[PDB]
Design a protein around this motif. Structure first.
Motif, PDB file in Angstrom:
ATOM      1  N   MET A   1       0.837  -1.186   0.000  1.00 19.77           N
ATOM      2  CA  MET A   1       0.000   0.000   0.000  1.00 19.77           C
ATOM      3  C   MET A   1       0.876   1.242   0.000  1.00 19.77           C
ATOM      4  N   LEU A   2       0.356   2.309  -0.595  1.00 23.86           N
ATOM      5  CA  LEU A   2       1.049   3.581  -0.566  1.00 23.86           C
ATOM      6  C   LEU A   2       0.010   4.681  -0.495  1.00 23.86           C
ATOM      7  N   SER A   3       0.182   5.577   0.431  1.00 26.79           N
ATOM      8  CA  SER A   3      -0.731   6.687   0.630  1.00 26.79           C
ATOM      9  C   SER A   3       0.164   7.886   0.865  1.00 26.79           C
ATOM     10  N   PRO A   4      -0.371   9.104   0.882  1.00 27.94           N
ATOM     11  CA  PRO A   4       0.479  10.241   1.273  1.00 27.94           C
ATOM     12  C   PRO A   4       1.195   9.977   2.585  1.00 27.94           C
TER      13      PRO A   4
ATOM     14  N   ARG B   1      -2.171  16.496   2.641  1.00 30.39           N
ATOM     15  CA  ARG B   1      -1.931  15.353   3.519  1.00 30.39           C
ATOM     16  C   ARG B   1      -0.438  15.091   3.687  1.00 30.39           C
ATOM     17  N   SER B   2       0.339  15.259   2.610  1.00 24.28           N
ATOM     18  CA  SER B   2       1.778  15.056   2.692  1.00 24.28           C
ATOM     19  C   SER B   2       2.420  16.084   3.611  1.00 24.28           C
ATOM     20  N   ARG B   3       2.015  17.347   3.465  1.00 24.08           N
ATOM     21  CA  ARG B   3       2.504  18.427   4.321  1.00 24.08           C
ATOM     22  C   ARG B   3       2.237  18.115   5.786  1.00 24.08           C
ATOM     23  N   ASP B   4       1.005  17.704   6.101  1.00 24.71           N
ATOM     24  CA  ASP B   4       0.647  17.460   7.493  1.00 24.71           C
ATOM     25  C   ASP B   4       1.380  16.242   8.052  1.00 24.71           C
TER      26      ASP B   4
ATOM     27  N   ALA C   1       6.278  15.185  -1.975  1.00 22.98           N
ATOM     28  CA  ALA C   1       4.872  14.900  -1.719  1.00 22.98           C
ATOM     29  C   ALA C   1       4.390  13.776  -2.635  1.00 22.98           C
ATOM     30  N   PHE C   2       3.432  12.996  -2.141  1.00 22.40           N
ATOM     31  CA  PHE C   2       2.847  11.894  -2.894  1.00 22.40           C
ATOM     32  C   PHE C   2       1.695  12.442  -3.720  1.00 22.40           C
ATOM     33  N   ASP C   3       1.716  12.181  -5.026  1.00 24.93           N
ATOM     34  CA  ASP C   3       0.676  12.684  -5.914  1.00 24.93           C
ATOM     35  C   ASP C   3       0.153  11.568  -6.807  1.00 24.93           C
ATOM     36  N   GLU C   4      -0.838  11.918  -7.619  1.00 26.38           N
ATOM     37  CA  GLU C   4      -1.449  11.000  -8.571  1.00 26.38           C
ATOM     38  C   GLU C   4      -1.042  11.483  -9.953  1.00 26.38           C
ATOM     39  N   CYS C   5      -0.250  10.683 -10.653  1.00 23.19           N
ATOM     40  CA  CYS C   5       0.289  11.142 -11.923  1.00 23.19           C
ATOM     41  C   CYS C   5      -0.789  11.130 -13.000  1.00 23.19           C
TER      42      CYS C   5
ATOM     43  N   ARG D   1      -7.055  15.803  -6.871  1.00 21.20           N
ATOM     44  CA  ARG D   1      -6.663  14.786  -5.907  1.00 21.20           C
ATOM     45  C   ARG D   1      -5.225  15.019  -5.454  1.00 21.20           C
ATOM     46  N   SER D   2      -4.329  15.311  -6.395  1.00 19.38           N
ATOM     47  CA  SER D   2      -2.935  15.534  -6.024  1.00 19.38           C
ATOM     48  C   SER D   2      -2.799  16.694  -5.047  1.00 19.38           C
ATOM     49  N   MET D   3      -3.627  17.734  -5.188  1.00 22.40           N
ATOM     50  CA  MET D   3      -3.530  18.852  -4.256  1.00 22.40           C
ATOM     51  C   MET D   3      -4.066  18.472  -2.878  1.00 22.40           C
ATOM     52  N   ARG D   4      -5.143  17.678  -2.820  1.00 17.77           N
ATOM     53  CA  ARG D   4      -5.576  17.138  -1.534  1.00 17.77           C
ATOM     54  C   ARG D   4      -4.477  16.286  -0.907  1.00 17.77           C
ATOM     55  N   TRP D   5      -3.808  15.471  -1.723  1.00 20.10           N
ATOM     56  CA  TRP D   5      -2.706  14.652  -1.229  1.00 20.10           C
ATOM     57  C   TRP D   5      -1.475  15.473  -0.864  1.00 20.10           C
TER      58      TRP D   5
END
Ligand SMILES: [Cl-]
Ligand SMILES: [Cl-]
Ligand SMILES: [Zn+2]
Ligand SMILES: [Zn+2]
Lengths: 372, 372
Positions: B123-126, B170-173, B143-147, B163-167
C-alpha cells in the motif's frame, strides 16, 4: 631493471620468498595473479587491482585472439596500453581454453584448428601462440602445450607429454627468433606427465635441457582433488630447477595455495576470487561465506573482520547481500575487490612468514581458523 | 548549516544560479541529480559519483520499499549509511513507479494498493510515502501525488490535479507531524495539470497556499515532446514561487536541460546518463555517440575530446567499444562515470554562464555544436 631476474631472499623447508624483477616492475613471490579474462580483471579498474597489492595479472590469449583480436590490439599499442595496466602481464598460451571452450577442434602435431565459441575458424600452433603473445606485448610468455585430461592412461599421458616437449622446443625457438620479444619478455615452460612420477621426471629433464626463465607445473587442478594434487607436487616440484620460479597454473583455493607454497610453488592464478565473488562467495579468515544467505541480511559487520581492503572499511555485509541479490553491478565490484584484496593479504602473510622463518606455524594457524 | 536555505546568486532572463544549503551539504543550482535506482547509482561507488561533481543524488522509494524494505534500511541506520553516500539525497514518493512498474493496482482517495513486480501486496498513501521517506532518512522529501498520463482529457487532468492537491496537504501534514523529519528534512510539492494553463495555475495556487520548500513541475517528459514540454514550462514555471527551487522531474537530454534552465528550472534528474551509458550511448559536446558502432573499433581518442573525467584521461573509445560489445562490467562502469561527469560539466558550464551573464550565448553555442 633487467629483462628477468629471480632472486630468492629467504627459504623455509621447500618454501621460498623473493622477487622477480622485470622491465615493467617487480613481482613479489609467492605471487597471486588476478585473471584478466579478456583485457579486464572483471569489474575492477586497473588502479583498483593495483591497490589490492597485485604486482602482475594474467591475460587469457584464447579470448583475446577472438575478440578484439591480437593484431588489432597490437595496432592499438598492445594490451598494456589498451586496458590501462602498465605492470607485468603473464599470458597463457591459449591451448587450454581451445580444448575447454571451442568447437570443431582438430589436433595434430602442427597445432590445433578450431571454431570460435561466433563459429569462425582459427588455428593455434606453438609458433602462432608465441606470435599472438608477442602482438599482445606479454611480459611472461607461456609455451604452447597439449593438455592432458584427468584421469589419463599412462600411454596417453606419455604421448601428450612428449608432444608438449616437442612443442616446448618449438616455442623456445619461436620466442628466440623474435629479437624484441627475446630481449624484453620471459618464456616459461610447462611440465606435463599427469600423476606419473617417471613422466614428470622426463618432462622436467626435457624442459631444463631446452632452458626456460620459469617452469610451470601443468596438468593439475583438473579434477584429481587436493590430496592427489599435493602428492604429485611432492615429487614434481623438486624436479624443476631450484633457481627459477615455479608456477602452479589454475590454483586455487586459499588452502591449496598454502599447501602448494609448502611444496615449493612461487606463482599462482585462478578465477576463483573474481568469478566466485560475482556469484556471492566472499573469502574470510574464518572460511568462505555466501553473502546471499539470509543470515547476512542485517549483518552490519564487514565481509571480514581483519581485512584492510576499502570494501571492508566502508560497507556492511548487509549492503553487499542486498546488492548481490538485486543483481547490481556494484555488488560484483565490491565482492571482487574484497576477494582479490583478501588473496593479496594471504600472499603477503605467506611472504612475511617465510621471510621470518615461521611459515610452518602460519600454515597451521591459518588452517585451524579457516576450517573451524 | 540550516535545514534548508535556497539563495539565488545571479539571474539571466528566467534562468537562475545559486545554492541550496542543507544539513548534509550544499547543492549548487542548476543541479543534476544522478539516479540511485535502489540504494546504488548503478555501476559507481559513491566516491566516484562525488568525484564527477554531483552534490545530491535521487533515491527511488518504490524499489527500496520492496527490496530491501524501508524498515530494514532504517534498522540498519538509514539509506545514507547503508549505501555510503553522506551528502543530500532526494527521494521520490514512489507513486510514479507504482503506476508504471507494479501490477494489480487499485487507486482510491486514500492511496494505492499494488502487487510487487514477487507478487507481494503493498500500500502507498500520502502518509505512508512520507513515512517511508522518513525511514530512509531522505533530505528532500517529495509529496505523494497522482500522476496524469499524456494525453489527458481536461476532465481527467483536473480530477487528478485536484486529488494531487488534496494529497499535497496530507503530505505536508504528515511531514510536519514528525518532529525529526520536519526539523532536518525539506518537503517539495508537485504541480500537476497536464498541458492546461488554467489547471497549472490552480495547482500552483494550491501548493503555494499550503507552502513547500521547493516546487516540482510534474507530469512532463511523459510523451509530449520537447516543443510541447517547453510550451508548458513557458507558462507553468512563472506560476511557482520565485524564491524557491523549481524541479523538473525526469528530465532529461542535454538540450532539454538547457532549454528548461532558460525557462526557470533549477533541478533535474534522469536515468538517461546511467541507463543509456550501460547500453552504449556516450554524451559528447558534438552530440551523443553509440560506442558499439564499428567506426569506434580502432579509435584511440577519448569518448569526448574536452571532457575532464578520469575515463577520458585514461581509456580510448576503442577499448570501451570492446568492453561494451563483450558485455564486460568495466564497460558499464566507464560509460556511466563518463556520462555522469559530462552531465555535471554541463551543469557547471550552465552555472558559470548564468553567473557571468552569458548563458544565452552559451545555449546558442551549445546547440550549434551539439546538433552539428
Ligand atoms: Cl573472472
Ligand atoms: Cl539507471
Ligand atoms: Zn575486505
Ligand atoms: Zn569523460
Amino acid at each position: 631493471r633487467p629483462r628477468f631476474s629471480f632472486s630468492i631472499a629467504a627459504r623455509e623447508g621447500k618454501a621460498r620468498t623473493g622477487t622477480i624483477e622485470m622491465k615493467r616492475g617487480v613481482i613479489r613471490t609467492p605471487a597471486f595473479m588476478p585473471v584478466g579474462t579478456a583485457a579486464t580483471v572483471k569489474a575492477l579498474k586497473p588502479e583498483t587491482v593495483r591497490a589490492t597489492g597485485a604486482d602482475i595479472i594474467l591475460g587469457n590469449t584464447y579470448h583475446l585472439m577472438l575478440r578484439p583480436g591480437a593484431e588489432r590490439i597490437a595496432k592499438l599499442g598492445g594490451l598494456h596500453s589498451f586496458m590501462g595496466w602498465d605492470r607485468p602481464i603473464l599470458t597463457d598460451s591459449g591451448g587450454y581454453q581451445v580444448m575447454s571452450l571451442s568447437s570443431l577442434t582438430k589436433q595434430s602435431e602442427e597445432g590445433v584448428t578450431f571454431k570460435s565459441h561466433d563459429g569462425s575458424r582459427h588455428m593455434l600452433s606453438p609458433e602462432r601462440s608465441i606470435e599472438i603473445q608477442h602482438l599482445l606485448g606479454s611480459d611472461i610468455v607461456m609455451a604452447f602445450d597439449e593438455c592432458t585430461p584427468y584421469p589419463a592412461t599412462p600411454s596417453r599421458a606419455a604421448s601428450s607429454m612428449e608432444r608438449s616437449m616437442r612443442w616446448a622446443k618449438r616455442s623456445r625457438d619461436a620466442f628466440d627468433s623474435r629479437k624484441e620479444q627475446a630481449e624484453n619478455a620471459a618464456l616459461f615452460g610447462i611440465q606435463q606427465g599427469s600423476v606419473f612420477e617417471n613422466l614428470r621426471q622426463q618432462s622436467a629433464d626435457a624442459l631444463a635441457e631446452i632452458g626456460f626463465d620459469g617452469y610451470a607445473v601443468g596438468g593439475l587442478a583438473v579434477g584429481e582433488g587436493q590430496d592427489e594434487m599435493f602428492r604429485v607436487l611432492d615429487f614434481s616440484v623438486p624436479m624443476l630447477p631450484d633457481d627459477k620460479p615455479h608456477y602452479l597454473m589454475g590454483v586455487g583455493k586459499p588452502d591449496d595455495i598454502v599447501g602448494a607454497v609448502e611444496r615449493g610453488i612461487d606463482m599462482f592464478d585462478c578465477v576463483l576470487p573474481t568469478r566466485s565473488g560475482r556469484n556471492g562467495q566472499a573469502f574470510t579468515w574464518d572460511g568462505p561465506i555466501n553473502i546471499r544467505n539470509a543470515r547476512f541480511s542485517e549483518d552490519l559487520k564487514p565481509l571480514d573482520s581483519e581485512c584492510h581492503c576499502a570494501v571492508c572499511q566502508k560497507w556492511s555485509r548487509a549492503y553487499i547481500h542486498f546488492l548481490i541479490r538485486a543483481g547490481e553491478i556494484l555488488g560484483a565490484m565490491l565482492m571482487t575487490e574484497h576477494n582479490i584484496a583478501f588473496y593479496q593479504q594471504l600472499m603477503q602473510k605467506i611472504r612475511d612468514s617465510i621471510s621470518e622463518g615461521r611459515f610452518s606455524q602460519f600454515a597451521q594457524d591459518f588452517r585451524a581458523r579457516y576450517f573451524a
